[PDB]
Design a protein around this nucleic acid. Sequence first.
DNA 1: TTCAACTGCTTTCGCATGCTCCCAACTACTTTTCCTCACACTTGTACTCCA
Length: 51
Amino acid sequence: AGVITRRLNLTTNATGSFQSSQLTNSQLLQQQQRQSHKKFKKLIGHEAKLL
DNA sequence: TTCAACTGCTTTCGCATGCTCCCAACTACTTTTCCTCACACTTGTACTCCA
């Protein structure tokens, strides 16, 4: 389909004009929810004296 | 004059597409905190050879 010109990060989602892919409006709460799902990383200090 | 010219534009369909990793698999040495007791000196109480 012709020739590839460029590529930038916006996304049409509002049946016409676009409302998506605006950068780091959610990244502040992205990398503070990634490392709570898995558990028990064993970076343990006074803990395990107990366990 | 005589001649090319190369640029411009148009149908026909259309064929229609062109600094080097990032992560697996091997492996290895090192990382991290724990664990159970040897060495040696010293101190005691004794009985020896002390005049």
